[PDB]
Amino acid sequence: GALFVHRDTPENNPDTPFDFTPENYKRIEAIVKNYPEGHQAAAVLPVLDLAQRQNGWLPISAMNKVAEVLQVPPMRVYEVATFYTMYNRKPVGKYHIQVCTTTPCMLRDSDSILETLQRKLGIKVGETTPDKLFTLIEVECLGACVNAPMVQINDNYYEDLTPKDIEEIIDELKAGKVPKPGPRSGRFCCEPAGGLTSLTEPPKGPGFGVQAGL
Amino acid sequence: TDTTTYKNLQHHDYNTYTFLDLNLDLSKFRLPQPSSGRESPR
Amino acid sequence: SGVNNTKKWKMEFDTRERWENPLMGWASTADPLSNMVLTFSAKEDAIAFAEKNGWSYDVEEKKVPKPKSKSYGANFSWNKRTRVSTK
Amino acid sequence: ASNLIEVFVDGQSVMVEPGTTVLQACEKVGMQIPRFCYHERLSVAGNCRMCLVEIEKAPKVVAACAMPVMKGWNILTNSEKSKKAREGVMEFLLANHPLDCPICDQGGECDLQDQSMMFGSDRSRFLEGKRAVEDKNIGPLVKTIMTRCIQCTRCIRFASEIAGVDDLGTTGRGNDMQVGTYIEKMFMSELSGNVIDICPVGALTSKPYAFTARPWETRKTESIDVMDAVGSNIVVSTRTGEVMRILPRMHEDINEEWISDKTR
Amino acid sequence: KTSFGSLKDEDRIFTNLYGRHDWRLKGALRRGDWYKTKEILLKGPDWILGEMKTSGLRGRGGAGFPTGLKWSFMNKPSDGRPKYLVVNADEGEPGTCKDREIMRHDPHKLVEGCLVGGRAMGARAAYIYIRGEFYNEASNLQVAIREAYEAGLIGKNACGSDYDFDVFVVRGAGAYICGEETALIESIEGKQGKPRLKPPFPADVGVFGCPTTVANVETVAVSPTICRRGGTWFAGFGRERNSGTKLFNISGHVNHPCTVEEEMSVPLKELIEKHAGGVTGGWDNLLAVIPGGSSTPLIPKSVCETVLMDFDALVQAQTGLGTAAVIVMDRSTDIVKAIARLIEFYKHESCGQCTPCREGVDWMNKVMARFVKGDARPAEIDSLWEISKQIEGHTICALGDGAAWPVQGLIRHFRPELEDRMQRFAQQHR
Numbered sequence A: 001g002a003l004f005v006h007r008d009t010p011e012n013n014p015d016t017p018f019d020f021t022p023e024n025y026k027r028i029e030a031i032v033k034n035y036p037e038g039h040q041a042a043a044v045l046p047v048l049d050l051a052q053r054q055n056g057w058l059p060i061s062a063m064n065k066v067a068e069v070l071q072v073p074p075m076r077v078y079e080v081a082t083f084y085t086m087y088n089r090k091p092v093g094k095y096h097i098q099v100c101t102t103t104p105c106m107l108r109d110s111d112s113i114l115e116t117l118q119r120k121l122g123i124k125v126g127e128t129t130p131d132k133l134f135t136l137i138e139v140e141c142l143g144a145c146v147n148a149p150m151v152q153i154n155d156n157y158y159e160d161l162t163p164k165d166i167e168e169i170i171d172e173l174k175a176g177k178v179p180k181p182g183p184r185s186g187r188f189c190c191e192p193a194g195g196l197t198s199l200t201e202p203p204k205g206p207g208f209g210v211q212a213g214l
Numbered sequence B: 001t002d003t004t005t006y007k008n009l010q011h012h013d014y015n016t017y018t019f020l021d022l023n024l025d026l027s028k029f030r031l032p033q034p035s036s037g038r039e040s041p042r
Numbered sequence C: 001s002g003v004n005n006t007k008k009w010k011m012e013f014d015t016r017e018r019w020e021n022p023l024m025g026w027a028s029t030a031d032p033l034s035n036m037v038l039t040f041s042a043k044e045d046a047i048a049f050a051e052k053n054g055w056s057y058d059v060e061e062k063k064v065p066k067p068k069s070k071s072y073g074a075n076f077s078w079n080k081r082t083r084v085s086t087k
Numbered sequence D: 001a002s003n004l005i006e007v008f009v010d011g012q013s014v015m016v017e018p019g020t021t022v023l024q025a026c027e028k029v030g031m032q033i034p035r036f037c038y039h040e041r042l043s044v045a046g047n048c049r050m051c052l053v054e055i056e057k058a059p060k061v062v063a064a065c066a067m068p069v070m071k072g073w074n075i076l077t078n079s080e081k082s083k084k085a086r087e088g089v090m091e092f093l094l095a096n097h098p099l100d101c102p103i104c105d106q107g108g109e110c111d112l113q114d115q116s117m118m119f120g121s122d123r124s125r126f127l128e129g130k131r132a133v134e135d136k137n138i139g140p141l142v143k144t145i146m147t148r149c150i151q152c153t154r155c156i157r158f159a160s161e162i163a164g165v166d167d168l169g170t171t172g173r174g175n176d177m178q179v180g181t182y183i184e185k186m187f188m189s190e191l192s193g194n195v196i197d198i199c200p201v202g203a204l205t206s207k208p209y210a211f212t213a214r215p216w217e218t219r220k221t222e223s224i225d226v227m228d229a230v231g232s233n234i235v236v237s238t239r240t241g242e243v244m245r246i247l248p249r250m251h252e253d254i255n256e257e258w259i260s261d262k263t264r
Numbered sequence E: 001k002t003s004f005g006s007l008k009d010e011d012r013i014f015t016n017l018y019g020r021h022d023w024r025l026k027g028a029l030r031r032g033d034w035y036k037t038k039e040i041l042l043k044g045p046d047w048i049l050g051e052m053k054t055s056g057l058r059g060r061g062g063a064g065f066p067t068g069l070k071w072s073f074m075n076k077p078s079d080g081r082p083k084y085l086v087v088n089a090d091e092g093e094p095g096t097c098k099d100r101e102i103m104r105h106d107p108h109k110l111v112e113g114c115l116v117g118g119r120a121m122g123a124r125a126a127y128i129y130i131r132g133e134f135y136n137e138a139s140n141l142q143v144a145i146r147e148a149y150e151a152g153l154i155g156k157n158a159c160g161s162d163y164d165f166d167v168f169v170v171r172g173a174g175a176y177i178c179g180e181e182t183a184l185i186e187s188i189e190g191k192q193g194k195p196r197l198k199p200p201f202p203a204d205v206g207v208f209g210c211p212t213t214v215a216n217v218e219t220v221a222v223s224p225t226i227c228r229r230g231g232t233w234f235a236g237f238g239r240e241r242n243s244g245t246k247l248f249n250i251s252g253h254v255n256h257p258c259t260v261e262e263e264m265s266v267p268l269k270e271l272i273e274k275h276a277g278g279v280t281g282g283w284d285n286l287l288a289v290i291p292g293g294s295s296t297p298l299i300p301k302s303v304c305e306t307v308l309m310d311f312d313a314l315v316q317a318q319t320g321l322g323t324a325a326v327i328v329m330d331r332s333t334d335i336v337k338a339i340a341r342l343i344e345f346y347k348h349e350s351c352g353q354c355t356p357c358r359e360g361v362d363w364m365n366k367v368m369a370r371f372v373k374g375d376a377r378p379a380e381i382d383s384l385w386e387i388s389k390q391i392e393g394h395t396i397c398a399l400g401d402g403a404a405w406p407v408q409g410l411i412r413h414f415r416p417e418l419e420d421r422m423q424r425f426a427q428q429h430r
């Protein structure tokens, strides 16, 4: 896939304009204050994530800016950004669709979801639409396995997907409205479909079954 | 005591800065951090 | 990192002239006592051989590595400078 | 036996300090545990997994470079479990090690070749294609052929702890993890030839010495460096009456195991 | 008791698993959270550790190590350093959603468990390392934490018990290896997520070099209910040495893929057609089950007929109970494709620090790719078995073991399938 080396380009040279907004600087100060004194170098991942959330992707200038803000080596910053997969070292679209193709999602047939996304967006996996609105990649497990098949778009989880359902999700994204995340098969969450096999009775409440002497 | 309706809808209107802004808001409730005896490990 | 070549004492000779052959440029020499080394189990055995054969000797003491205090927990120290920034 | 503990190696008793590793106990009794990432002057990393040995009444092999002996352990260094672990680790290394021995500057000075002949198997079960890594340009002193790298982090630990530059590191994950600099950075500092010294494979070679001679060709002459006034002990390697290379010497009171770049 | 299962709703701990009730502080107080927490903390550390030991609760992470002993490892006087409780909410394992569900729909139990465990060990802070993809879950956890801070349950007076406690939430960036204990510790410390060797154990050297303890979200969340209702009740549920409730995530080829909370030692069959709605096509259509997440090997139907869901029962069945992820595969499943996809996942998620896992798991990914294609010969099955046995037990963390185990299970059980595939490829080629 991607290459874990850097090449200077006119869009990703170490002179591209990046700087934190003052509210982002306040958030960085909050993260550093959360971490201990003398171990404030542990704030590399949240500050890098904040830089990514500000700028979209993470240029080499943003990496160097995070390094000089945290007084941590730029090589350590590069190590973090290249080890971890949620940091985009290349520009991506406005909507970054991640399709989980791990084994239970494959069992619940996420391959149809992947091929219908490829046909609908007119692109292959790992590439961006020419209008820079959609990037489509395969990923590993995203933590919602009983809700297979599923995608993640930006920070939002779309679950119990049929090809028709992911088509309306893409249509809503193209129209510009919020696609109302969650499962799309009529069930609310991970509960069993067609009835509730547990937790039918109301919860008992405080002071239930408490032992003596407490 | 409604049980037939999903009531987690508060996570639907969450922007890209919700976690960081709430951390910044909550930062005034924390205890002072311990000191490692140095500004940095150098 | 192997240390098996540092177990036996060795006797060598002083190096002499190795000039250049006019014909081929080979390394030509004039001493016979250059390409030889002798192995010994003990420093005093090597010294005894040298004094028996009548050669003036320079003896160098055995350089053994000093024992080191190695600990994997020093790489993650709370306050010391031994904490590493990477792995 | 005050401030001392008794530990057995192959049934032989020895007295060691607390905190002494299994590898340190083995070199105390007189044998050398195989190693690729451990260096006695670098921090303990414990990733190459070559130093796995079997302790008696223990079903899990332990890394000798990191595990400290506690009390009365029996270190079975030449056991069947230890031999199988060494064979597996070496064949895992040589699965993706490139097939570059004749064109390699680490011809006879190869710990990988040596320890492979000594402990590893003699054949390959690898029926796949090897991985290839693009080469870096960290400077005209150190030539980098990073396909040969086995990712032991010796150079990274050396640059972090002794050179103190924090310029080298591991970028990536899994089999695609690459040792070097993320950007095109010139790795020039003091003591920058010692990465060529301590790299066990021929990944970090010497550019002036490149493709010149072989260790069996070179004659070793013990001498003293005079470029500065520290008086560091060196080995001058000369082949056919011509100086070919400068190497350090182990002298703990002067220069330990390293020499300056001007010296080298 | 002899036959297990049929857990009662009043004895179920996670009363808001499906999110049908309010997850905020009002809903938590209605459901019974944060009750007599000050009394718990005034009872103090030794009483809570004794409650855990009488509970016999084991790690829900998949390690299976006794929670009481693991939390009593930090029952020591301080050496001038702080002590930390760390919660693992990474949920990397495929097939598993239970920690995500309980954090999203019931986070005040998690916060109360952080407080209870921190008081039990003796600690000033609990760092909850959540997966980076769980942005909404992390935000909901942060909302609950702010509610607890405003209500005074956390911070400078832990429910008025004169105990200073902090709860931090730190987000990862998508690493199954950062799901691991020590690699999680390094991820919190800010380095790239490579596990560190043991010793030093985290009870001596953890995050920032301080004595820490990494614990699962499910274990931490069932901690305060265990303390409130007693350890004898939790020990009475379940079998001997496998006691209490457990969140099972049943997914794959089942009619209702769901997360349920059920008593331990339930039969796998009874679990499947009691909560999953049965296998798609039926129990005769069932082919294989991975019962304890993708680090555990597969088991066929003939041993799935009467296998229990215990740690010891699955060990006797040559498997393990990990994060209780029951992945079900029917007769139409390409089983070799499923296992090869799992090995590809492990290749993509290995951190690459140590040579056996790095090189060998890449090798096994390539070999199982050729196995799916059929492009091998039957000696390579034994070669792959030897490669897996060389990986297992020679790595730094247990990711190498968790990658070698599914191939070991596939070779042990579905070996005629592989031989038939190679024979089919050979007869079609020539």
Ligand SMILES: Cc1cc2nc3c(=O)[nH]c(=O)nc-3n(C[C@H](O)[C@H](O)[C@H](O)COP(=O)(O)O)c2cc1C
Pocket (backbone or CB within 6 Å): E058, E059, E060, E061, E062, E063, E064, E065, E067, E070, E088, E089, E090, E091, E092, E093, E176, E177, E178, E179, E180, E181, E214, E215, E216, E217, E219, E397, E398, E399
């Ligand atoms: C490679 C690897 C990944 C793991 N990922 C997770 C994870 O995402 N979540 C988790 O709770 N445990 C995970 N574990 C298990 C941890 O060891 C366990 O959570 C931790 O030690 C806490 O112990 P406990 O189970 O007693 O709570 C993982 C283990 C390994 C070897």
Ligand code: SF4
Pocket (backbone or CB within 6 Å): D097, D098, D099, D100, D101, D102, D104, D105, D106, D107, D110, D111, D112, D113, D148, D200, D201, D202, D203
């Ligand atoms: S470093 Fe590799 S290519 Fe070079 S001699 Fe050693 S084994 Fe051969």
Ligand code: SF4
Pocket (backbone or CB within 6 Å): D148, D149, D150, D151, D152, D153, D154, D155, D156, D179, D198, D199, D200, D201, D203, D204
């Ligand atoms: S370049 Fe050499 S010293 Fe550095 S990690 Fe690779 S093999 Fe080790």
Ligand code: SF4
Pocket (backbone or CB within 6 Å): E177, E194, E195, E349, E350, E351, E352, E353, E354, E355, E357, E358, E395, E396, E397, E398, E399, E400
């Ligand atoms: S077993 Fe794999 S994931 Fe674990 S330390 Fe080794 S390379 Fe990393």
Ligand code: FES
Pocket (backbone or CB within 6 Å): A100, A101, A102, A103, A104, A105, A140, A141, A142, A143, A144, A145, A148, A150, E093, E094, E095, E096
């Ligand atoms: S396997 Fe796809 S979300 Fe877990």
Ligand code: FES
Pocket (backbone or CB within 6 Å): D034, D035, D036, D037, D038, D045, D046, D047, D048, D049, D050, D051, D052, D063, D064, D065, D066
């Ligand atoms: S020498 Fe111990 S693991 Fe490398």
Ligand SMILES: [K+]
Pocket (backbone or CB within 6 Å): D106, D195, D196, D197, D198, D199, D200, D201, D202, D203, D204, D205
């Ligand atoms: K070298």
